[PDB]
Design a protein around this ligand. Structure first.
Ligand SMILES: O=C(O)c1cccc(C(=O)O)n1
Ligand SMILES: O=C(O)c1cccc(C(=O)O)n1
Ligand SMILES: [Zn+2]
Ligand SMILES: [Zn+2]
Lengths: 332, 332
């Protein structure tokens, strides 16, 4: 009921990305009937979205009703475009980052921005992060759980973290690009399961890959309660102890030690799950996050947190605000 | 401390399945240390296994040091062989179910068998089910979190469940056949992550399969605390509310209403994880299990459970032996 770290927005419209770059596979936004807009990935309507997804005044209005002071705006993860030619992805990012900056400058007390980067091109990414921080004044950027074949361990992605740490730029890691075919192609599994597992895979890839060790000041936040992690860190930190040959290759420390090193959002729905998340990550490293305006998100922002009979005043207002404030590097 | 529901065992030697069935790609055991072996996937070896893995007498001694009263024996998962020709798998299942009977006869109050079956052939596997219960005395069977493409919801499998529901034969569902290549070929992730995900997938498949609903009397138990399920059940439950088009076409009851319908083992390594599990799955429904004799298992059987400072010594008993008996329908 204060700060929302996990929300997604889209320009009302953008150019024919196919026309613009010369090849296909991009997404376009069709406004056909009123109130609704169809997202197209060449051919299929892959998701239908309402006005709140592109129109800030509509968002301020829903925010006002739900008591939410500020949303951190990031793009829809499908816009990452990590696959395309680096200079084309970078062109998109500058356009989505500019649109993001336009929305913030208009309600700077209601929004802050989390940019996207052309991650497949680490040098291009690091340039947009400078521009995003010095020019646009973004506190941080939102990034995928993996860049094609690279997981958040690849040393190639090291120029980006070194940048983020120097630029005091936060990192919100979002699962995306799950497997969508075959056995996941049913029961919404790509989303109920495939997603938390991408986040588990990334949290693992980072710790064991040494990143938190190499950049002890790189501030990270993972989506969806950290995925399965808070419950399976026990298994994970044990397999680590049992096979240093498979696991301790790049970073000797036990995963159990980076607990308290990173944040997650509190999007876990159940109160028993929230208790554990704070139990295991710290009442200081958990951040309210809604997946606004998507349905798989928390419909009543902060409700789960102000129901916790376990939590007192300073802890609820931490999970609801101060943690966000701390992670972004802003202040009341 | 009492009953261990999760232990794997192998014959000391088995024939040449390649020069016995017509094709390679099978598994076979090789010795080279008067008490050490290596398992071959037609060429190279992927697991090095001590003597405790095949010799019953060796297992009793260790059981005895550790306070372990009875072990439930099953075949190492990689032995399932769902990919082979139906017969060339049913054959191997008889060989292994028999070398399982054999061992329980040798120690009828220290062992019980959970037989394996030729799952990619519902009817064959239905009969081999009949055997194990009526002739071999098996109280259940171990099976994989999936079968080729078949997920535990496929209607091809419904005859197997009906049969199990008659024969009063419990199912221990065990992960396996995780992704090895691509992005998982590092940090052991296939075991640290793909395994816990494969279980989560099988529990979902079964709930939204309506398997539990068409078979109220099927006693099923999952490996490793149900994977991610206990933590992510909220997410799945809320997802099922929001998208009944993708989620509820096969069974309409929200997954949250099955909390209490299946067991899991207790292999979660952490007291915070164990405590969440009994709160989500239930005290009546969590069964101690060790994964003996594998390194990712609990080295000191029953220990986490006996530390659980928040369980009365009666509750610790349900977890050690109480729940295992009820599930297998066995006599204290
Ligand atoms: O674009 C997506 O796939 C996405 C991203 C964040 C949340 C959600 C959701 O949970 O609905 N979906
Ligand atoms: O045979 C397997 O693949 C297997 C089965 C259960 C546990 C383990 C393990 O986690 O060590 N490995
Ligand atoms: Zn999101
Ligand atoms: Zn096992």
């Amino acid at each position: 009921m204060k700060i929302d770290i996990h929300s997604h927005i889209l320009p009302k419209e953008w150019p024919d990305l196919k026309k613009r770059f010369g090849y296909g596979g991009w997404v376009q936004l069709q406004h056909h009937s009123k109130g609704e807009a169809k997202l197209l990935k060449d051919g299929k309507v892959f998701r239908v979205v309402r006005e709140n997804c592109w129109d800030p005044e509509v968002r301020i209005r829903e925010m006002d009703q739900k008591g939410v002071t500020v949303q951190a705006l990031s793009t829809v993860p499908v816009m990452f475009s990590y696959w395309a030619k680096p200079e084309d992805t970078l062109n998109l990012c500058q356009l989505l980052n500019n649109d993001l900056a336009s929305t913030v400058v208009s309600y700077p007390r209601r929004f802050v921005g989390l940019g996207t980067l052309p991650m497949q091109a680490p040098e291009l990414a690091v340039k947009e992060m400078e521009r995003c921080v010095k020019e646009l004044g973004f506190p941080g950027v939102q990034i995928g759980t993996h860049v094609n074949e690279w997981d958040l361990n690849a040393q190639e992605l090291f120029p980006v973290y070194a940048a983020a740490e120097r630029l005091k730029c936060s990192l919100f890691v979002h699962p995306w690009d799950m497997q969508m075919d075959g056995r996941m192609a049913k029961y919404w599994l790509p989303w109920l399961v495939g997603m938390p597992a991408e986040t588990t895979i990334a949290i693992c890839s980072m710790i064991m890959g040494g990143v938190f060790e190499k950049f002890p000041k790189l501030k990270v936040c993972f989506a969806h309660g950290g995925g399965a992690f808070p419950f399976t860190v026990g298994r994970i930190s044990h397999g680590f102890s049992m096979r240093p040959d498979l696991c301790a290759q790049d970073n000797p420390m036990n995963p159990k030690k980076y607990l308290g090193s990173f944040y997650t959002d509190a999007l876990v729905h159940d109160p028993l799950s929230l208790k554990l998340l704070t139990d295991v990550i710290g009442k200081d490293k958990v951040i309210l996050g809604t997946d606004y305006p998507f349905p798989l998100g928390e419909l009543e922002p902060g409700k789960l947190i102000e129901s916790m009979e376990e939590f007192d005043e300073e802890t609820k207002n931490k999970l609801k605000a101060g943690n966000a404030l701390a992670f972004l590097g802003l202040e009341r």
